[PDB]
Design a binder for this molecule. Structure first.
Ligand code: F6P
Ligand code: F6P
Ligand code: MN
Ligand code: MN
Ligand code: MN
Ligand code: MN
Ligand code: MN
Ligand code: MN
Lengths: 252, 252
């Protein structure tokens, strides 16, 4: 499998999930269908999303790691799947939630070759490959502002911070693409409970990187060895190469 | 002018303001075009919307306290209008921004008789009149949440908090409606500099209170004497009656 193949499968997935959720009225979406592989309720809308995805997906030679259903298959391309990040927002009709996909030639983030984040609410498509990061077919890169007086996404502000704006939309993959686009100058999930999972962060991280962003663990450690088919925890510090050290200092 | 008048007015403007915005490129939107009378830059998205609304409100016997051109007219019916609330989103394509209209029978908030917040991205319509509060013509009401461990929207988390979640979507007018319909447990703006202005909060407050919420200033004192002028600013604490006293001791 290559990137184009990856781009082709993701768009196919994007359309199906898009359709399944779009149909489901809020009061259906909100219902607990079961206990997720993640340890949190699997709501009716996450069930349809993950279903749609997994039907296109498992016709591939992939080992998939998905939010609700765990580790699936044994193929040697790993897919970090988030069938619907922003669940809370979709169950109440707030237009920020996506399907996020990250393909790797190993069970390690450092071998990622393709990243994909589709805005299920607005139909906004992001992805990055060996040619660059994109939004709705147009190239994108991170902003170049290096003052901490900036536009930050942040989970969570523990204290008084210097930011210009602080925002929390509730969708780690999409917010990372909000960082990738330059819409926001940084992204931070610095909660001492390292709560992010590999599939919520996988592609946005990848994509954040092709658009120029520097992205690391809390202490600036590399995200290269974060694993898939293991239950990985992530904290993220993501900014251009310039603001990046200052943030690192800022929370230290 | 009647509660039934105010809604038809509000509806004209939302549709005109929605066409106007939807047809501007993000490129053309984020462009500064002047100093608003509120002390911030007017962006092109801001005046396009404002001109389109004002174009209609000018037919009515009112005084408008509007963000970009300030207070225009001498009618007896007062209208607070944020032409565009969430401009930063709007100029990013983040789909959370609205037109806000609050109509009062006088200068003060206590005389409000109608509230209207319309999401210009989604089409969602939030209004309230004597008949209560609505979301797209469906009766709404706030959360029943009695627990401080809840889903909060707050500006700005500066300390270690016990909410089950925290969110900040960038449009308080809109976010006041997410609490109004019970999509969130509480809205809090507690920024010490008291940032909010009347057109930010008046319609969201009126909608939420009609939805059964207790909405007050930072102390717990009512907002009834908040002024429909440009100098007015405020802090906000929003929750159901049981929860509301709780956040007051919390934020103490
Ligand atoms: O992961 P937490 O603890 O919910 O923090 C918020 C994040 O949760 C995620 O759903 C990840 O599971 C993100 O979409 C959201 O932005
Ligand atoms: O940009 P800030 O400082 O985060 O303030 C956010 C506020 O912006 C407003 O548009 C008012 O300026 C509100 O809708 C939102 O609640
Ligand atoms: Mn889950
Ligand atoms: Mn999810
Ligand atoms: Mn997720
Ligand atoms: Mn302004
Ligand atoms: Mn505005
Ligand atoms: Mn505003």
């Amino acid at each position: 499998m290559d990137e184009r193949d990856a781009l082709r499968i993701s768009r196919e997935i994007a359309g199906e999930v898009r359709k399944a959720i779009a149909s489901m009225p809020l009061r259906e979406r909100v219902k607990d269908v079961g206990m997720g592989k993640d340890g949190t309720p699997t709501k009716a809308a996450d069930r349809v999303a993950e279903d749609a995805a997994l039907e296109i997906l498992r016709k591939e030679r992939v080992t998939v790691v998905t939010e609700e259903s765990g580790v699936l298959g044994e193929g040697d391309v790993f897919v970090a799947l988030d069938p619907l990040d922003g669940t809370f927002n979709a169950t109440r009709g707030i237009p920020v939630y996506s399907v996020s996909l990250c393909f790797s030639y190993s069970d390690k983030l450092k071998d990622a070759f393709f990243g994909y984040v589709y805005n299920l609410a607005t139909g906004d498509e992001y992805y990055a490959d060996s040619s660059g990061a994109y939004r709705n077919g147009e190239r994108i890169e991170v902003s170049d502002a290096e003052e901490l007086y900036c536009n930050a996404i942040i989970y969570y502000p523990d204290r008084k911070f210097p930011f210009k704006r602080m925002r929390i939309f509730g969708s780690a993959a999409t917010e990372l693409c909000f960082f990738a686009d330059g819409s926001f100058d940084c992204f931070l999930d610095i909660r001492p409970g390292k709560m992010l999972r590999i599939y919520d962060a996988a592609a946005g991280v990848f994509i954040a990187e092709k658009a120029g962003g520097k992205v690391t663990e809390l202490d600036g450690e590399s995200l290269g060895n974060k694993k898939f088919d293991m239950q990985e925890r992530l904290n993220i510090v993501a900014a251009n190469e310039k603001l990046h050290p200052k943030l690192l200092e800022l929370i230290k």
